[PDB]
Design a protein around this ligand. Structure first.
Ligand SMILES: Nc1nc2cc(O[C@H]3CC[C@@]4(O)[C@@H]3O[C@@H](n3ccc5c(N)ncnc53)[C@@H]4O)ccc2cc1Br
Ligand SMILES: [Cl-]
Ligand SMILES: [Cl-]
Ligand SMILES: [Cl-]
Lengths: 310, 625
């Protein structure tokens, strides 16, 4: 194991993120036992994860990690239980993970982080009900929004627009945000207010469409420009934790749940693949930038699974 | 001083965290007992069989530390009233699990949120935990003054914030609490942890929490303004509410991260201690009535029972009361005997119910100050107090004072009196039976004689107090009516309550009573305009008395005699609380009834809704004649 790297990795795996070069980023939390903290790990060999001794870099954070995101190719943006948004930077040699900034602006657990299209700004959502826009360079909050009436479950930056992002909450709102407008959020959704939204994924090719998962295993296809829901399917038996699109020209949608399964769906939301590999909640999913049919999942069972999607 | 706690949703290492909050000056810590993000499954395989441990060990703290320093918190994903069945069932099982771990640990309090209108199943699961093992533990319902939906930034283009006045809508969170504690059947173990926002609501909304069991106040760091030196401070309005809450002796909870980063978490706390120390000090009445706040006591029945020595001693610890009696006798002697008669006219003064003699000495001080001559008869039925009187007359008073060990209604007096003086009044004026006692004595008063007191009037005001209603409810005794507690009045230093309308006079008595057909029985109808949305739990009683002319005593708050602390107010409860809406009138009916043997009160509310007639035939409560 490298220097500064913790001798042991925390059981609860929170995030799995493939970098453009192929190096896997790992977010971990200790959600039980004596100490409730976290760790950040780099795996230049994704097949060596979760093994601690066969890693490129590793660090320990003060509190657990609720959300993670690659900021470029060296930066790591962390949503902490501490109320902090943390930015860590990879070493010149990429052998250490050093803290750039740790800012305590949120009044409760920071649950969701998203990097804005340019890579200069970021958006965070919290249990404190706020949404904050961050200037990563100045290490400051530019805008704090209290649009929601309950905890912010998810925030997703639009692919190619630095002003646009999606947000969802336990207040049953899915908000479209344009910081260019005097009133930046706009309430969008289906004709009927159903089950609470739990996950969002912007479409990688159609910048006016997104997918949203709910608390009851339903996945929904939404055109923002038509503001009425077209397709929907009961994919999972429990809350949809995450939605991640394949890098493909015609993308595949990977769906995660508390039902402990992974589903891979086509354009019409039909089921292609299904993996019951996990024996605990599936927390993240990342498609390899190298082999496009290779999808990686992490759960609370401490399994780093590598699936081959047909 | 201030008892305060630190609210946290992140505790990486319990020992270091506790030490840090202790260093900062906090008395206790509010913290999760399971990891807030650690969602647990109880039904579906494989997540159900998740290897343990399910949380941190109890071994990490001493029993004393768990019992006194830790307030547990329900996990935020526990949603017993969710519209998703699977969630409802897992949240029920998770709620019991966490509540049971808190009970296992012996935690002194445990926080649960009220963050939506419907908490029916949250209440069912809590109620079921309270009825599983008898424990002392408190449940603090975290409720905001302003619901987050009514606090949200007006930034949603297609969903604007309401800019219109919504009197009842702005009071919505009080109803969340009311319904929750109604469902839970007014458990004494369920109190409020009132969370205060950056913008305070209209005063009516703050007033809705009056009379409610507030155990804690939650102050987010974000509501603190920054002063010129950079220290956390509060708005004059927030300061106003802190002073109300200090009088209620609530525990102050600091939630949120440090936003005055140039300082420490002890600076938020330092400001509260500053506000606490700088509040007005306790006056004579405020120091007297210290441990008596909302403590229910049986009204004294000095006619039926002989009062103890230490009861007359506290009775005597009231300089204002006796100064007033002195001034009343002083004024009367001067009006009764002119300066040219100041040596030929010796006034025959009678102290009727003389106790240990404070009105006998007050009569003597009055005669010396008036430079007039007096003859005194000290009448006392209590033989034990008569021992003090006879040792006083032998050792000091001399032949001037004639001690009579008799009931004033049975005493055959040798001569008539010019003035009869007495202190037979209770908190409701006539409740100790001063009318009956003086009526049976006025036969020995001269045809032109004076009674000190000459007149008295009782007053009633409608009140709201879920604290006192629950206090009365807890007065169930075996071998009597299960509801008799509500059909009797209590003497209490009414503290956590809300006066719903100004007091109005109830019964008046005049002495001497020149009626050819003397009737002490009464019937009075009172109509009380209520301008708030509230819940009626009873009627506060007070009194005013005219001793002589302009010399008066009063316990009516609007005319209260300054520095006089003999009588605390009376409280007449009602079996069932009554909902009262703004603009509605509370109509009460009060009766003063009697026999040859006993006297009592009966009462009933007839608007906005009817109550049962309370204490019919004096079945629950009588005053012995
Ligand atoms: N609520 C309060 N009631 C007070 C009453 C007091 O004086 C009363 C009570 C004690 C006392 O010494 C005396 O009058 C006597 N007393 C009664 C009835 C009566 C009879 N019929 N004949 C003679 N004696 C008779 C009886 O024994 C004195 C102070 C009081 C303070 C407060 Br606060
Ligand atoms: Cl309800
Ligand atoms: Cl009692
Ligand atoms: Cl009041």
């Amino acid at each position: 194991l490298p220097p500064n790297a913790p001798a042991c990795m925390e059981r609860q795996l929170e995030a799995a993120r493939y970098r453009s070069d192929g190096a896997l980023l790992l977010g971990a939390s200790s959600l039980s036992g004596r100490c409730w903290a976290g760790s950040l790990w780099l795996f230049k060999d994704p097949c060596a994860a979760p093994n601690e001794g066969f890693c490129s870099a590793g660090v320990q954070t003060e509190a657990g990690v609720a959300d993670l995101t690659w900021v470029g190719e060296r930066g790591i943006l962390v949503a902490s239980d501490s109320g902090a948004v943390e930015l860590w930077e990879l070493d010149e040699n990429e052998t250490l993970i050093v803290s750039k900034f740790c800012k305590y602006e949120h009044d409760d657990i920071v649950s969701t982080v998203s990097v804005l299209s340019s890579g200069t700004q970021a958006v965070s959502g919290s249990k404190d009900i706020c949404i904050k826009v961050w200037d990563l360079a100045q290490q400051v909050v530019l805008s704090s929004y209290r649009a929601h009436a309950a905890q912010v479950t998810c925030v997703a930056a639009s692919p190619h627009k630095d002003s646009v992002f999606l947000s969802c909450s336990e207040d049953n709102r899915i908000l479209l945000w344009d910081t260019r407008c005097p009133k930046p959020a706009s309430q969008i959704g289906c004709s009927a207010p159903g089950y609470l939204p739990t996950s969002l994924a912007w479409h990688p090719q159609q910048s006016e469409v997104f997918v949203f998962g709910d608390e009851n295993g339903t996945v929904s296809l939404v055109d923002t420009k038509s503001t009425s829901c077209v397709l929907s399917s009961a994919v999972h038996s429990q809350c949809v934790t995450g939605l991640v699109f394949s890098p493909h020209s015609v993308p595949f949608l990977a769906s995660l749940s508390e039902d402990c399964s992974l589903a891979v769906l086509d354009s019409s939301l039909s089921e292609l693949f299904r993996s019951q590999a996990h024996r605990d909640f599936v927390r993240d999913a990342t498609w390899s930038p190298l082999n496009h049919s290779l999808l990686t999942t992490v759960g609370w069972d401490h399994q780093v699974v590598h699936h081959v999607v047909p | 001083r201030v008892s305060s706690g630190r609210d946290l949703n992140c505790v990486p290492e319990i020992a270091d965290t506790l030490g840090a909050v202790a260093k900062q000056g906090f008395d206790f810590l509010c913290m999760p007992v399971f990891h807030p993000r650690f969602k647990r499954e109880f039904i579906q395989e494989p997540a159900k069989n998740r290897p343990g441990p399910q949380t941190r060990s109890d071994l990490l703290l001493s029993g004393r530390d768990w019992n006194t320093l830790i307030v547990g918190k329900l996990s935020p994903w526990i949603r017993p009233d969710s519209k998703v069945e699977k969630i409802r069932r897992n949240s029920e099982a998770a709620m019991l699990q966490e509540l049971n771990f808190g009970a296992y640990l012996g935690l002194p309090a445990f926080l649960l949120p009220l963050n939506q209108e419907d908490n029916t199943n949250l209440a069912r699961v809590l109620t079921n935990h309270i009825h599983t093992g008898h424990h002392s533990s408190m449940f603090w319902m975290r409720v905001p003054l302003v619901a987050p939906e009514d606090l949200r930034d007006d930034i949603i283009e297609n969903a604007p914030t309401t800019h219109t006045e919504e009197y009842s809508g702005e009071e919505k969170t009080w109803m969340w609490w009311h319904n929750f504690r109604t469902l839970c059947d007014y458990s004494k173990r369920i109190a409020v942890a009132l969370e205060i926002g950056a913008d305070l609501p209209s005063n009516h909304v703050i007033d809705r929490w009056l009379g409610e069991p507030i155990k804690a106040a939650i102050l987010p760091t974000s509501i603190f303004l920054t002063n010129k030196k950079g220290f956390p401070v509060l708005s004059k309005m927030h300061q106003r509410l802190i002073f109300r809450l200090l009088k209620l002796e609530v525990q102050f909870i600091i939630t949120g991260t440090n936003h005055h980063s140039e300082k420490e978490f002890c600076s938020y706390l330092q400001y509260l201690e500053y506000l606490s120390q700088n509040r007005p000090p306790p006056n004579a009445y405020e120091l007297f009535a210290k441990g008596y706040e909302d403590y229910l006591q049986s009204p004294l029945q000095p006619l039926m029972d002989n009062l103890e020595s230490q009861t007359y001693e506290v009775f005597e610890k009231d300089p204002i009361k006796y100064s007033q009696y002195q001034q009343a006798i002083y004024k009367c002697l001067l009006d009764r005997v002119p300066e040219e008669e100041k040596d030929t006219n010796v006034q025959v003064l009678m102290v009727l119910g003389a106790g240990r003699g404070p009105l006998v000495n007050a009569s003597l001080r009055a005669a010396k100050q008036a430079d007039r001559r007096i003859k005194l008869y000290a009448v006392e039925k209590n033989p034990n107090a008569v021992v003090t009187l006879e040792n006083w007359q032998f050792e000091e008073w001399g032949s001037q004072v004639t001690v009579v060990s008799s009931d004033m209604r049975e005493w055959v007096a040798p001569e008539k009196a010019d003035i009869i003086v007495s202190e037979l009044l209770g908190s409701f004026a006539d409740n100790e039976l001063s009318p009956e006692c003086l009526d049976g004595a006025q036969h020995f008063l001269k045809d032109d004689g004076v009674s000190i007191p000459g007149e008295y009037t009782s007053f009633l005001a409608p009140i709201s107090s879920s604290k006192l209603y629950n206090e009365v409810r807890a007065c169930r005794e075996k071998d009597r009516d299960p509801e008799a507690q509500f059909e009797m009045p209590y003497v209490v230093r009414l503290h956590n309550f809300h006066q719903l309308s100004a007091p109005q006079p109830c019964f008046t008595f005049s002495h001497p009573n020149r009626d050819p057909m003397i009737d002490n029985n009464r019937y009075c109808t009172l109509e009380f305009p209520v301008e708030v949305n509230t819940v009626l739990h009873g009627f506060a009683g007070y009194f005013e008395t005219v001793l002589y002319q302009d010399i008066t005593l009063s316990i009516r708050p609007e005319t209260h005699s300054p520095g006089m602390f003999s009588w605390f107010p009376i409280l007449f409860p009602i079996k069932q609380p009554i909902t009262v809406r703004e603009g509605q009138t509370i109509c009460v009916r009060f009766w003063r009834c009697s026999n040859s043997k006993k006297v009592w009160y009966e009462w009933a509310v007839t608007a906005p809704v009817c109550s049962a007639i309370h204490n019919p035939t004096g079945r629950s409560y009588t005053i012995g004649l």
